[PDB]
Amino acid sequence: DKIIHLTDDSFDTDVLKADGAILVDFWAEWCGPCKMIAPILDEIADEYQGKLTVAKLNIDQNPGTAPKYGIRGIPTLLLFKNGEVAATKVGALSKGQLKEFLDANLAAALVQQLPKAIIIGVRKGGTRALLEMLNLHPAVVKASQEIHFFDNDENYGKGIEWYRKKMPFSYPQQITIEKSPAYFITEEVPERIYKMNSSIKLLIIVREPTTRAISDYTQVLEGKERKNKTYYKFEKLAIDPNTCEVNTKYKAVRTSIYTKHLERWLKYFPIEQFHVVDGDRLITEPLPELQLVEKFLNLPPRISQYNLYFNATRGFYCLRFNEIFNKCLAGSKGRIHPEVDPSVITKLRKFFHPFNQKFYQITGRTLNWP
Numbered sequence: 524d525k526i527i528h529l530t531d532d533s534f535d536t537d538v539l540k541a542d543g544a545i546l547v548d549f550w551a552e553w554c555g556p557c558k559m560i561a562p563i564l565d566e567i568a569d570e571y572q573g574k575l576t577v578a579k580l581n582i583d584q585n586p587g588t589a590p591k592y593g594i595r596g597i598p599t600l601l602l603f604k605n606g607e608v609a610a611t612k613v614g615a616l617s618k619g620q621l622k623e624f625l626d627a628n629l630a631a632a633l634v635q636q637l638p639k640a641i642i643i644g645v646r647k648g649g650t651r652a653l654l655e656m657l658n659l660h661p662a663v664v665k666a667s668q669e670i671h672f673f674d675n676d677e678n679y680g681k682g683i684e685w686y687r688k689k690m691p692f693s694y695p696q697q698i699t700i701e702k703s704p705a706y707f708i709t710e711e712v713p714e715r716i717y718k719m720n721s722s723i724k725l726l727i728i729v730r731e732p733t734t735r736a737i738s739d740y741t742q743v744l745e746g747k748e749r750k751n752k753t754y755y756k757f758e759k760l761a762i763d764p765n766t767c768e769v770n771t772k773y774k775a776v777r778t779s780i781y782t783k784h785l786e787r788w789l790k791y792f793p794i795e796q797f798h799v800v801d802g803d804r805l806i807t808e809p810l811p812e813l814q815l816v817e818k819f820l821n822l823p824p825r826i827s828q829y830n831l832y833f834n835a836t837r838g839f840y841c842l843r844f845n846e847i848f849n850k851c852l853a854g855s856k857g858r859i860h861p862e863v864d865p866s867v868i869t870k871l872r873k874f875f876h877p878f879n880q881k882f883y884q885i886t887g888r889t890l891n892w893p
């Protein structure tokens with residue numbers, strides 16, 4: 524239910540310490556009009572998702588708050604804009620009367636905003652899955668395609684205004700998020716993002732290093748199988764034949780060394796502006812990982828178990844927004860990996876181990892890979 528039921532205990536957290544526009548309805552079971560506008564409020568919460576949050580406060584069970592604002596009779600509607608009464612309305616009113624009161628008081632013009640958080644990587648970590656799942660939140664709009672702005676000198680030269688006009692439209696209250704997995708490893712990107720928005724928030728979703736490398740390789744092989752071209756076995760690319768050790772020049776191994784790349788980014792951004800998503804837990808138990816991202820982005824908790832249903836035939840979780848809109852990810856997500864010689868997997872696990880430890884230390888998240 525899109526409506527938020529308040530208590531006197533949780534009014535500071537949910538309205539005053541909150542951000543965005545919130546309409547609070549003060550009501551009680553003995554107020555006829557209050558029960559006559561309850562259906563209207565239900566339709567408003569749905570037609571104004573994005574630009575307004577509708578909340579109720581039952582003054583019978585919560586007698587503390589209403590006096591603090593001069594609430595004489597009920598119903599009384601208080602529109603808060605970022606913990607500050609911006610408007611009031613007293614006594615019942617029609618759905619069209621409420622729409623006139625809101626529309627003439629909400630800054631709800633559709634706008635193209637620069638992203639306030641960027642998923643900077645990693646390739647095959649679950650970037651698409653992370654983006655689509657965060658979009659489940661009513662405050663988040665996703666950039667549908669990968670934009671590739673800071674990692675492409677042709678695009679970067681077109682100005683930050685070009686980047687902005689690539690973004691989707693949104694109510695100014697929402698936040699926009701973009702995904703471009705190449706940003707993580709491209710050298711010039713951290714300083715360019717920093718110039719744009721030195722306080723931007725950066726998301727990194729990682730998987731088990733060896734597994735991410737094989738997933739990487741598998742994507743390249745599909746695109747080569749399709750074109751009827753020859754490639755090589757993962758074992759031949761990942762192991763140097765002269766030493767039988769890990770070949771550090773292989774791009775898919777280089778990209779799983781998450782800590783060498785992160786340290787380039789820490790030259791410019793503090794660790795407090797990063798959040799690391801456990802891409803493995805996103806595959807098997809995603810909801811807790813999404814709740815951490817909600818708090819990282821200073822968003823209220825709106826993603827629930829209802830929004831994630833497991834698809835047994837697919838082997839992955841799928842998304843459910845409302846009662847009728849359902850979505851699984853594209854066909855290229857969830858490829859079966861080739862079987863890889865166990866000895867090589869052991870050599871890679873032993874190879875990544877010290878880099879994993881350094882990664883846990885810097886980020887403060889221990890992901891329990893080998």
Ligand SMILES: Nc1ncnc2c1ncn2[C@@H]1O[C@H](COP(=O)(O)O)[C@@H](OP(=O)(O)O)[C@H]1O
Nearest residue numbers: 647648649650651652738839840852856857858
């Ligand atoms: N709900 C989901 N559906 C499909 N793949 C998902 C998923 N949640 C996470 N993933 C993972 O994200 C990978 C794709 O990442 P990206 O979008 O960054 O390329 C998938 O690659 P695999 O084919 O290796 O399983 C899979 O491991």
